[PDB]
């Protein structure tokens, strides 16, 4: 039950960063722990693991000892120190519990982006019907989330209270910046009478934009 990775985010090539992972619900020192990473296009890769008390570790050979796995038994925390980063280390990193050779609990994952580019917050634009279009029994609304770096953002509607008819489209990189969008459909009798607002959170820039949809 539950492993939670620290916030990852943006790091410059050649620089260092440390991930942490907080364990709960089991006796931490009764289990090995591991880090695994995933890059789109594609594939999971085993990064490192550590025994109960941290006296023995394993590392993916190609890391050349640039990574250090360690655990604070007194605080139920697993660390991954990463040194001298290259773009090839950009990935989603997962904390995992290791038992008898298999990974039986996984964290939510945290993304690390190795880039010289600057953190840029998202611009959030409303997508509303207009242009003298008619309207039927439902209306599809959306938000266009443009110009941000690095990944990721999270989009919710009405602080999460609108959820049923939402589509979130995966981000695409263009001109060094990310773009994504999200759509929601509500009955047309209910908008704009009952307000609809998209909330876009971008941890890397510590920014949340809460954009109200207007006709």
């Amino acid at each position: 039950v539950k492993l939670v990775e620290s916030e990852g985010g943006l790091v410059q090539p050649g620089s260092s960063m440390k991930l942490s992972c907080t364990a709960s619900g089991f006796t931490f020192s009764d289990y090995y722990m591991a880090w695994v990473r995933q890059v789109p296009e594609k594939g999971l890769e085993w990064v490192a693991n550590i025994n109960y008390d941290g006296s023995s570790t394993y590392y993916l050979d190609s890391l050349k000892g640039r990574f250090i796995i360690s655990r604070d038994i007194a605080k139920n925390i697993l660390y991954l120190q990463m040194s001298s980063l290259r773009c090839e280390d950009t990935a989603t990193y997962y904390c995992a519990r290791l038992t008898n050779g298999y990974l039986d609990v996984w964290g939510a994952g945290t993304t690390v982006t190795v880039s010289s580019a600057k953190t840029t917050p998202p611009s959030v634009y409303p997508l509303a019907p207009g242009c003298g279009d008619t309207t039927g029994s439902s209306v599809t609304l959306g938000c266009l989330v443009k110009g941000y770096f690095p990944e990721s953002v999270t989009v919710t509607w009405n602080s999460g209270s609108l959820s049923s008819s939402v589509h979130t489209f995966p981000a695409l990189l263009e001109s060094g910046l990310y773009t994504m969008s999200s759509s929601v459909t509500v009955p047309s009798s209910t908008w704009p009478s009952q307000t609809v607002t998209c909330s876009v959170a971008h941890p890397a820039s510590s920014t949340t934009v809460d954009k109200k949809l207007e006709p």
Partner: peptide, 12 residues
């Protein structure tokens, strides 16, 4: 598919 089109916003 249900297809919806949107112009650029005045904000953009």
């Amino acid at each position: 598919p249900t297809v919806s089109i949107f112009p650029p916003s005045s904000e953009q």
